[PDB]
Nucleic acid binder design. Structure first.
Ligand SMILES: OC[C@H]1O[C@@H](n2cnc3c(NCCCCc4ccccc4)ncnc32)[C@H](O)[C@@H]1O
Ligand SMILES: [K+]
Ligand SMILES: [K+]
Length: 545
DNA sequence: ATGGGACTTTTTGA
DNA sequence: TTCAAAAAGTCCCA
């Protein structure tokens, strides 16, 4: 329900929006939290505002109504005109109202607190400053009735597999006053994800992004599996449009290293660099000058992409794995004819250059003709989960029989030489599958088009793709998920560019030697490491780095 | 108990 | 008809 933002980050965000406010010029700033919860941000906003007013009370008294501007009147003023909060949870709003009332401890004061869905409220004026931490809800945990509303009314930032907080970015930008400043902490995934493309376009074309703080896979929220970033944007009449990017360099740090977050950002734990907002394409490549030179060099040298030369596909989606996946030593497999059985691997079975021997079998139930010839398999293996299987979407509509795989794909795509890689990994792991391995969606596969077989071999491809050069090169634009995990999905893996030059033969031969060592029983992996270093040297020579 | 490490399903819009 | 994206991941241990 309610998530607690660490106090240091709250202080940083509030100071980011208010440290340079000219209260004498405008003693009526509107500061809004659109998902205020119990007031994590708004109470700190109250404290900052109270200091700001009390420090200039006499200047305000002289410049304006001298009877209105007294210290004893600051509290009331702040609540009447400055602090605004919205949240869909009425208990949180009640608690926050009590807190703001008890900031003073007569005639009653009207607190601008709204218990509503902030994405449906008719907002009747814009705001000078917007801060907070919106709700994050993905496409699976959002109700379909609400998602229809989002797809209709928030189509500019919300399509397909987008997230709820995209819409909060939209709403915050839309209700921000000209010259206003907004600062929020959200998931970092929209910076790189395919779903966030339109949201990135919206932000880039409607506000000036002041600062991005990328915590990468650091754990900012205790016991929460999410990776966070802090965005600061404004609607000021500026002529430069340069973004300050602070990228964490050590994900293992605890956030309470210093009293303030500014000390952490200025320290050696973070790196700083500037990105020209006008040079952002539909993809935001937020890297330092050395990494940008590296990336551009590789992009310029390589004339092909994997998408050009390869056919990609996601793995089997059974819809209920426990009903179709059995250990190869399970006695129940004696009931299943071997024509129905396929080898089954998980993402952990994928190493560099080769796949572990499979230990699981998939019952490719689509080839079961009818329920009377193979009644025993259905009665004793698959039918154990009939109730769950019948609740799949395609079974409810009758497209799929209750014992069939939900997305069984095409068998001929898997029963061939191909390259496989895990969907989430700490490093590049592209393996040649020789054993017709099937897998779930945690492993992706591709094979080379016939017309590119004489230009690229599987051995050469796994050679360059597993190199240190390509590990770094892919990670430059990859989607950082959690600590030591990057997404390896076709929507970015197929964008990897490859080359073909005079080092092709030696690179291919080194890859073949590595594969031969890795498949031998009396394995000595050290020479594999030495061969990999030599191949990395060849690749760096080829790409001019 | 918590914080850190190993590992990854099927629901879902298009 | 049937593709592929999506971590307020999930689950475990010392
Ligand atoms: O980050 C968590 C905080 O954010 C608040 N909050 C969440 N969602 C909000 C929202 N609209 C979205 C509605 C989506 C559908 C829905 C969500 C939750 C329950 C029932 C239905 N509008 C304002 N505050 C919101 C929530 O109370 C916490 O205080
Ligand atoms: K006066
Ligand atoms: K994390």
């Amino acid at each position: 329900g309610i998530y607690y933002t660490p106090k240091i980050i709250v202080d940083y965000i509030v100071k980011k929006t208010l440290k340079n406010h000219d209260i004498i010029k405008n003693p009526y700033p509107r500061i809004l939290d659109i998902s205020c919860g119990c007031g994590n941000f708004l109470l700190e906003v109250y404290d900052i505002l109270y200091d700001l007013f009390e420090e200039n009370i006499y200047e305000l008294k002289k410049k304006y109504d001298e009877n209105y501007w007294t210290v004893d009147n600051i509290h009331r003023h702040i609540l009447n005109y400055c602090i605004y909060g919205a949240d869909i949870d009425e208990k949180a709003i009640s608690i926050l109202k009590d807190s703001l009332t008890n900031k003073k401890v007569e005639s009653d004061i009207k607190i601008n607190l709204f218990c509503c869905d902030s994405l449906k409220k008719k907002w009747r004026y814009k705001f000078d400053y917007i801060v907070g931490n919106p709700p994050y809800i993905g496409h699976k945990k959002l109700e379909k009735k609400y998602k229809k509303f989002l797809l209709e009314k928030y189509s500019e930032v919300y399509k397909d597999k987008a997230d709820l907080y995209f819409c909060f970015y939209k709403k915050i930008i839309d209700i921000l006053k000209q010259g206003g400043i907004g600062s929020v902490i959200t998931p970092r995934y929209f910076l790189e994800s395919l779903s966030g493309k339109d949201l990135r376009e919206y932000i880039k074309s409607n506000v000036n992004v002041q600062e991005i703080v990328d915590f990468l896979g650091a754990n900012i929220f205790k016991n929460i599996g999410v990776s966070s970033c802090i965005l600061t944007f404004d609607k000021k009449k500026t002529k430069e449009t340069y973004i300050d990017v602070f990228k964490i360099k050590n994900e293992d740090i605890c956030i309470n290293k210093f009293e303030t977050l500014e000390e952490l950002l200025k320290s050696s734990k973070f790196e700083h660099f500037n990105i020209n907002q006008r040079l952002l394409s539909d993809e935001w490549i937020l890297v330092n000058k050395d990494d940008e030179t590296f990336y551009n060099k590789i992009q310029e040298k390589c004339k092909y992409s994997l998408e050009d030369i390869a056919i990609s596909f996601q793995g089997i989606i059974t819809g209920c794995d426990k009903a179709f996946i059995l250990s190869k030593d399970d006695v129940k497999l004696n009931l299943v004819d071997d024509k129905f059985l396929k080898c089954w691997i998980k993402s952990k079975n994928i190493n560099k250059y080769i796949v572990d021997k499979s230990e699981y079998r998939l019952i490719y139930s689509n080839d079961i003709d009818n329920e009377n010839t193979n009644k025993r398999i259905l009665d004793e293996i698959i039918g154990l989960y009939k109730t769950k299987l019948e609740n799949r979407r395609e079974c409810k509509s009758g497209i799929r029989k209750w014992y069939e795989l939900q997305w069984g794909r095409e068998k001929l795509f898997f029963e061939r030489k191909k390259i496989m890689y895990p969907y989430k990994s700490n490093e590049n792991r592209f393996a040649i599958d020789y054993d017709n391995n099937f897998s779930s969606a945690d492993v992706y596969s591709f094979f080379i088009k016939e017309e590119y077989l004489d230009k690229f071999s599987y051995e050469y491809l796994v050679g360059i793709l597993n190199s240190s050069v390509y590990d770094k090169y892919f990670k430059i634009t990859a989607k950082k998920m959690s600590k030591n995990i990057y997404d390896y999905y076709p929507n970015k893996v197929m964008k990897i560019r490859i080359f073909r030059d005079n080092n092709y033969e030696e690179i291919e031969n080194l890859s073949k030697q590595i594969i031969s060592i890795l498949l031998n029983k009396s394995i000595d992996k050290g020479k594999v490491e030495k061969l990999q270093i030599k191949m990395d040297n060849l690749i760096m020579d080829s790409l001019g780095i």
